[PDB]
Amino acid sequence: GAISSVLNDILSRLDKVEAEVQIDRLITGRLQSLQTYVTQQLIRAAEI
Amino acid sequence: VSMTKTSVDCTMYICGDSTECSNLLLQYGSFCTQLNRALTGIAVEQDKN
Amino acid sequence: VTLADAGFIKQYGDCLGDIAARDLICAQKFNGLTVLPPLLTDEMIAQY
Amino acid sequence: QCVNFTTRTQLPPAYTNSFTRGVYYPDKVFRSSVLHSTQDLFLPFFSNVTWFHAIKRFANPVLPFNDGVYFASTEKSNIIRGWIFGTTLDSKTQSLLIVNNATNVVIKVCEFQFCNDPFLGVYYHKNNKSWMESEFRVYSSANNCTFEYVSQPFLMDLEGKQGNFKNLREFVFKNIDGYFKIYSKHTPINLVRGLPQGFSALEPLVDLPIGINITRFQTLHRSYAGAAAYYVGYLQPRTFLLKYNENGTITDAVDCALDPLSETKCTLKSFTVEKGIYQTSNFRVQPTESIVRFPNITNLCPFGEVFNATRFASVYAWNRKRISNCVADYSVLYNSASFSTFKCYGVSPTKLNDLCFTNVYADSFVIRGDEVRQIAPGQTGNIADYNYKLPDDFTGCVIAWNSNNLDSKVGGNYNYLYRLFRKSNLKPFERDISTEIYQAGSTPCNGVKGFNCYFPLQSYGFQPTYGVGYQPYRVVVLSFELLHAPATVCGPKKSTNLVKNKCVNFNFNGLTGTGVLTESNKKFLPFQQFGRDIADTTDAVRDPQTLEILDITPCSFGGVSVITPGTNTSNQVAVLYQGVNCTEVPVAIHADQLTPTWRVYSTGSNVFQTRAGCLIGAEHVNNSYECDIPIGAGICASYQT
Amino acid sequence: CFTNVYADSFVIRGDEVRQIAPGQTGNIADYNYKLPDDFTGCVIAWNSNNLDSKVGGNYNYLYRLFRKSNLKPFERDISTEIYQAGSTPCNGVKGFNCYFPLQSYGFQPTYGVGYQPYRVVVLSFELLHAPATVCGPKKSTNLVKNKCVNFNFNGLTGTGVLTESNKKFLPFQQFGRDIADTTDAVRDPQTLE
Ligand SMILES: *[C@@H]1O[C@H](CO)[C@@H](O[C@@H]2O[C@H](CO)[C@@H](O[C@H]3O[C@H](CO)[C@@H](O)[C@H](O)[C@@H]3O)[C@H](O)[C@H]2NC(C)=O)[C@H](O)[C@H]1NC(C)=O
Numbered sequence: 007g008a009i010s011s012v013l014n015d016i017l018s019r020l021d022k023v024e025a026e027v028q029i030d031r032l033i034t035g036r037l038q039s040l041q042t043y044v045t046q047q048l049i050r051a052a053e054i
Numbered sequence: 055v056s057m058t059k060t061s062v063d064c065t066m067y068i069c070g071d072s073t074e075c076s077n078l079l080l081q082y083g084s085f086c087t088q089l090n091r092a093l094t095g096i097a098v099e100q101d102k103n
Numbered sequence: 104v105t106l107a108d109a110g111f112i113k114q115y116g117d118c119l120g121d122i123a124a125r126d127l128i129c130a131q132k133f134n135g136l137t138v139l140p141p142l143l144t145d146e147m148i149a150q151y
Numbered sequence: 152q153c154v155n156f157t158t159r160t161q162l163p164p165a166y167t168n169s170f171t172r173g174v175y176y177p178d179k180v181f182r183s184s185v186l187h188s189t190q191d192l193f194l195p196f197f198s199n200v201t202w203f204h205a206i207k208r209f210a211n212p213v214l215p216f217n218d219g220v221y222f223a224s225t226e227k228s229n230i231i232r233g234w235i236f237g238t239t240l241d242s243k244t245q246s247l248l249i250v251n252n253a254t255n256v257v258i259k260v261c262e263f264q265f266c267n268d269p270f271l272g273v274y275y276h277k278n279n280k281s282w283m284e285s286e287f288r289v290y291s292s293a294n295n296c297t298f299e300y301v302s303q304p305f306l307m308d309l310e311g312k313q314g315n316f317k318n319l320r321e322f323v324f325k326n327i328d329g330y331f332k333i334y335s336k337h338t339p340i341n342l343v344r345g346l347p348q349g350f351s352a353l354e355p356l357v358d359l360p361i362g363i364n365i366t367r368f369q370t371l372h373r374s375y376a377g378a379a380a381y382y383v384g385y386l387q388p389r390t391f392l393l394k395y396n397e398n399g400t401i402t403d404a405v406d407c408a409l410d411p412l413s414e415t416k417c418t419l420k421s422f423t424v425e426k427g428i429y430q431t432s433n434f435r436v437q438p439t440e441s442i443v444r445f446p447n448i449t450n451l452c453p454f455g456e457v458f459n460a461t462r463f464a465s466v467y468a469w470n471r472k473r474i475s476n477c478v479a480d481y482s483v484l485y486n487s488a489s490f491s492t493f494k495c496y497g498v499s500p501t502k503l504n505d506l507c508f509t510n511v512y513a514d515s516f517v518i519r520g521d522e523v524r525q526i527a528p529g530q531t532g533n534i535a536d537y538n539y540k541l542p543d544d545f546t547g548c549v550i551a552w553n554s555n556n557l558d559s560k561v562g563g564n565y566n567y568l569y570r571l572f573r574k575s576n577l578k579p580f581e582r583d584i585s586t587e588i589y590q591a592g593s594t595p596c597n598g599v600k601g602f603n604c605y606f607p608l609q610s611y612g613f614q615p616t617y618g619v620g621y622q623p624y625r626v627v628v629l630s631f632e633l634l635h636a637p638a639t640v641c642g643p644k645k646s647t648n649l650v651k652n653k654c655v656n657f658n659f660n661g662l663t664g665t666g667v668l669t670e671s672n673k674k675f676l677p678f679q680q681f682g683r684d685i686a687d688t689t690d691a692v693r694d695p696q697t698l699e700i701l702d703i704t705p706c707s708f709g710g711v712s713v714i715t716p717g718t719n720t721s722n723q724v725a726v727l728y729q730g731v732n733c734t735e736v737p738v739a740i741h742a743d744q745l746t747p748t749w750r751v752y753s754t755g756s757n758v759f760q761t762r763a764g765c766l767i768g769a770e771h772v773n774n775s776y777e778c779d780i781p782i783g784a785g786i787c788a789s790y791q792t
Numbered sequence: 793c794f795t796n797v798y799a800d801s802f803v804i805r806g807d808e809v810r811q812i813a814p815g816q817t818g819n820i821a822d823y824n825y826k827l828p829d830d831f832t833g834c835v836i837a838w839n840s841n842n843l844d845s846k847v848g849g850n851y852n853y854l855y856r857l858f859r860k861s862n863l864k865p866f867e868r869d870i871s872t873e874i875y876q877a878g879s880t881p882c883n884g885v886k887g888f889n890c891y892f893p894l895q896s897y898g899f900q901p902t903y904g905v906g907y908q909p910y911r912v913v914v915l916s917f918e919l920l921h922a923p924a925t926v927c928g929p930k931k932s933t934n935l936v937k938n939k940c941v942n943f944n945f946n947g948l949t950g951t952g953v954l955t956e957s958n959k960k961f962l963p964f965q966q967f968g969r970d971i972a973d974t975t976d977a978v979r980d981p982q983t984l985e
Pocket residue numbers: 252253254255257284287299301
């Protein structure tokens with residue numbers, strides 16, 4: 007839901023107040039994407 | 055008997071070479087240390103296995 | 104068995120240039136995903 | 152009066168190792184029995200602290216104050232009376248004075264013309280048993296001022312009395328966010344000449360709202376058989392981990408980036424580290440400079456031909472002008488107070504000088520002032536519905552101002568019109584020129600008009616009597632698209648020489664990033680500006696001044712693990728740079744920067760390559776043993792004779 | 793309650809009142825009054841032509857137009873050094889493309905809104921994380937211990953039992969915090985226990 011996926015593109019085109027509203031998304035979406043990977047790897051590690 | 059050990063740099067993944075992103079990531083507290091601790095736990099266990 | 108990324112030193116000259124177009128583990132590495140080597144090598148496991 | 156006594160009197164600058172000084176309570180909050188981590192301006196542990204000593208005749212140098220200062224004096228009998236702070240110190244800029252005098256402290260902020268060799272001094276035993284501070288030869292004039300304080304004398308002559316020991320003052324000064332924070336501590340000390348081994352913390356003393364740029368400072372000796380010395384350290388932005396004991400006193404600390412062991416202590420959040428190997432904050436090479444590469448176009452873009460045109464098109468037939476092959480400067484638009492409204496989408500106007508544009512169209516028209524709201528994307532109303540729709544995902548700026556003072560006429564201006572009706576609401580960036588009669592009644596119709604068969608346009612008779620919201624507004628929309636294509640409009644930013652095979656902060660056309668550039672062999676077609684990775688990040692670029700294609704690679708980085716016996720067995724540690732052929736660690740010299748500030752280990756001979764990375768500060772031995780601490784790929788490490 | 797309060801007061805044109813908010817930009821914000829990115833406080837403004845706009849022009853109200861660098865948050869500059877807008881260095885009272893750095897408002901009551909003068913006040917406190925020095929009209933209650941109560945000290949509200957501690961807060965400390973960053977202890981503002 008950010009205006010771009012490229013982190014530097016968000017910074018190249020927005021001011022230090024409006025950028026954070028876009029960056030919080032990329033952070034919250036990426037952070038969720040890691041928590042899914044690590045949960046799936048702990049469950050695979052439990053099988054191995 | 056094992057699988058590939060992986061360490062994921064949670065700051066470089068989320069905020070790749072952005073300092074202003076890294077200052078926002080710090081607002082979420084320990085989650086990158088929890089992810090690093092979990093993947094280190096898996097990695098140490100592949101040698102134990 | 105086709106072992107993708109054993110972790111044995113990607114010394115940049117094998118990961119930039121012509122190979123970089125055809126090697127997905129260089130994109131993984133450049134995004135901070137690192138594959139670590141096993142403690143016991145494929146020789147030590149062969150000796151045991 | 153000011154006096155020209157002698158000179159600076161030789162070279163007094165000495166050096167010392169500031170062990171564990173300049174730690175202070177980071178916030179006005181109590182904590183106890185806790186390991187607390189804080190990021191602030193702090194004195195680094197084991198820093199190369201500067202030293203000055205009184206031995207006769209002497210003077211005090213003016214010193215930098217960059218990022219804030221730690222000041223201390225090893226003292227007896229009150230020679231150090233205060234400090235001067237500022238940036239020119241000569242009444243051209245206002246500056247700060249702190250002094251303790253025979254009545255009391257002063258803190259004052261003025262356009263001081265300080266003396267070149269400022270001094271204070273006392274006359275001994277002047278027939279009244281008192282010794283008296285007649286001299287205040289510190290400034291000639293204090294021409295204008297903005298802050299004053301006075302109260303009492305800050306002379307806490309401590310216990311033990313009469314100079315039985317030496318007395319250490321410590322101070323920390325942080326000019327941040329217009330507020331000059333002072334912290335301070337007093338302690339007895341008995342060291343003959345150095346700065347003392349041991350731990351102490353500074354309380355926050357006063358917070359002064361002085362509002363001045365301080366780049367330099369000086370201290371103030373008194374004058375008249377006693378002798379004294381002062382230390383100057385410089386703060387840096389760091390992370391510190393503080394051991395608050397059960398009384399809530401900072402009893403010990405770890406400087407989180409002093410050395411690899413201190414960084415493991417800061418990672419595990421403990422003063423003891425168990426025997427093992429620990430991953431810690433990952434290393435990266437910093438950029439050695441910047442590159443900027445915009446097209447070498449020079450002709451200024453035709454903004455006057457849009458914004459100061461003779462007559463604007465009518466909003467049913469809005470004029471589109473293409474701005475291309477030219478240099479813009481959006482600051483000379485945006486800082487012009489003449490614009491009543493200037494709002495942007497997908498960009499902020501402050502960035503329009505940092506960035507290039509694929510192609511640009513200016514759309515230009517006149518509308519009523521209360522309809523200016525209708526020009527923004529997603530809107531509804533006669534303009535937006537029937538004759539000028541922006542797309543739901545527009546990027547660009549809309550800019551508007553009233554033009555009664557140019558285009559409103561007492562006999563009525565009627566050359567400006569809009570469409571009243573349409574069969575269906577228009578697609579974004581459509582233009583409809585047709586004059587066909589609109590069938591508002593159920594019957595078909597023909598000819599010049601019918602009953603409930605309207606002429607489709609409706610006009611406005613702008614007259615300068617009309618109120619705000621009924622006046623004419625000249626409006627322009629700048630409608631660019633960004634970064635995904637070979638741009639030809641740019642800000643006034645000058646390009647640079649290019650450089651390759653080094654880490655650099657690059658910027659091509661406004662695509663900012665950090666990386667190492669290389670001569671690629673990718674065949675980009677003439678319509679392609681950037682090449683992308685599976686991760687949607689840019690991995691190659693066509694340079695906009697010499698038309699070759701450069702590969703972008705992130706410059707060297709990898710994991711750092713620290714190897715240790717238990718801290719109660721030893722403080723020696725070894726570093727594993729995992730994934731690295733470390734013939735680069737010689738390139739990791741601290742001439743340029745690296746993220747982990749420590750780099751002593753790179754000294755060599757104790758460097759060993761492994762399939763896991765390279766291991767530094769541990770010696771390779773041929774005889775095998777049980778695996779004590781596991782590195783990887785058959786290698787282990789251990790602590791032994 | 794507030795740690796300490798400062799009121800900032802000044803005059804600007806009404807259409808530049810938008811520049812006083814934090815993160816904003818323009819000839820006021822960039823060159824003479826910047827708020828910090830994390831400002832805590834209130835910005836308050838009103839037109840004052842009816843008190844200090846004058847038919848010949850008021851010219852006692854001035855604003856900086858040039859500076860080598862944009863000023864830091866809550867910085868103030870009194871300097872009158874000539875600004876080198878041209879490529880040459882220069883000296884004296886003026887030169888070609890060397891400007892006196894200030895430019896005056898001229899305020900006459902004929903001006904429209906946006907050009908009219910506004911008196912602006914900014915209140916700039918920091919809250920609760922330090923011993924407070926000035927606040928609201930709320931009357932204190934008596935105090936009670938060893939019972940559950942809805943407490944409120946200096947505006948730090950919460951619910952708990954209150955008890956005589958033996959923690960030694962230093963004179964600069966108002967609150968203790970737990971490992972969890974919750975308030976664990978408080979120094980009472982009427983009896984300093
Ligand atoms: C130490 O430095 C101080 C700052 O320069 C200096 O303070 C000055 O003290 C005198 C005497 O009190 C003041 O003079 C005024 O005192 C009261 C003010 O209400 C009036 O009754 C007097 O008529 C007179 O106006 C100065 O104004 C004051 N300066 C400032 C800036 O406050 C001390 O006197 C210095 N002490 C020594 C020993 O030098």
